[PDB]
Structure formats: C-alpha cells, structure tokens
Ligand binder design. Structure first.
Ligand SMILES: [Cl-]
Length: 191
C-alpha cells in the first residue's frame, strides 16, 4: 500500500556455485544486480528482536528508506518511510529519528527510541525477476568480514507462496536449508 505492505516471503541460503548457476539459468545479467546497504538499529538488550521486529534504514541509488518490520496475522507488516540524506545521517550518527509512521509504530510497541542505535551495516547485491505470480530475488550479501548467497520468493498468499517456492527448489534443484533473516544472520554473527 501507500507506505505500508504485507510481506509474504520464502527463502533459503545457497552456495556460491549454486548462486552462480542460478544467475546463468535464469538469464540474469551482471547489470541487473543493484547494490543496497541495510543499516540496522536495535537496543542494547535487543527489544526489537524480542518483539520479532526489525528496524533498518536502507540506502539504494541515493534513496534512503526507513523501514520497520513487525508481526502480522499473515506474514509481516512492513512500514516504509522515505528519508532525506540529512534525516538518514542524523539517525545513523546520533540516534535522532524523524517523526512519522515508523516512529508511531515503534512507540505503539513500547520501544524506547532513546535506547535505539546503529548496530551495523549489511550490504546486498540484488537481482529481481517476476516469477509466476510473484517476485524472485537473488541476494549476495556481505557483512562483518564474511558473505553469503540467498534466493527468496515474494508471494501474495502464504499458501500459494509455499507451493511456488517448493516448485522453484525442485525445478532448479536447490536443496533447502534453515535460513533466518539477513538482520538475524547479521547479529547472530555479531554475537
Ligand atoms: Cl555485496
């Protein structure tokens, strides 16, 4: 919707060689990959994690986006807000966030905004294609000295997303493995 959206997502990590094979078989060019930086925010005691939520500022092609992800009956509720470079920099450098729908949703979750701070940055090189009735993302990410590769399917219903993703794993012979979110893979490494 207009700032808010429901995220229905299926995901698995893959090897470097499998990722490289998928780029070839899906006929994805080098120029299709776009670079983005995810700057993560969290309290010392990890309050957003305890409420199954994630707060980031994304930087992509000179556009900054403030994003909260929180639990929702179906999938996760994603609340997006555009920021200027000024607002993004203030948040990153001095933990001063702008008023708006993201701030409102944080305060509705009883998150002390004065305790939030920039914990680190994960970079992702991403290619996206329309697959069936959804979107298929190829993510090569780097963070805290290491890197990894990931395929994800963005669906519209939980039922159809499962069917479509299981079809992708079978069709392209991808062996599925347990896969937590980028932000969780980030600070599980940080810990
Ligand atoms: Cl990267």
């Amino acid at each position: 919707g207009m700032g808010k959206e429901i995220e229905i997502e299926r995901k698995t990590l893959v090897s470097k060689e499998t990722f490289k094979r998928l780029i070839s078989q899906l006929h994805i060019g080098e120029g299709d990959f776009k670079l983005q930086r995810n700057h993560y925010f969290e309290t010392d005691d990890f309050q957003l994690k305890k409420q199954s939520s994630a707060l980031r500022i994304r930087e992509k092609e000179a556009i900054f986006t403030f994003t909260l992800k929180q639990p929702h009956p179906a999938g996760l509720l994603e609340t997006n807000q555009t920021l200027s470079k000024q607002e993004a920099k203030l948040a990153l450098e001095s933990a001063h966030f702008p008023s708006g729908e993201v701030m409102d949703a944080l305060r509705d979750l009883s998150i002390p905004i004065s305790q939030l701070k920039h914990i680190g940055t994960l970079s992702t090189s991403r290619a996206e294609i329309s697959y069936e009735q959804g979107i298929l993302c190829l993510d090569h990410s780097s963070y805290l000295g290491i890197e990894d590769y990931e395929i994800e399917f963005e669906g519209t219903s939980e039922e159809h997303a499962t069917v479509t993703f299981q079809e992708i794993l079978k069709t392209f012979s991808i062996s599925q493995v347990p896969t937590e979110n980028k932000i969780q893979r980030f600070f599980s490494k940080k810990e």
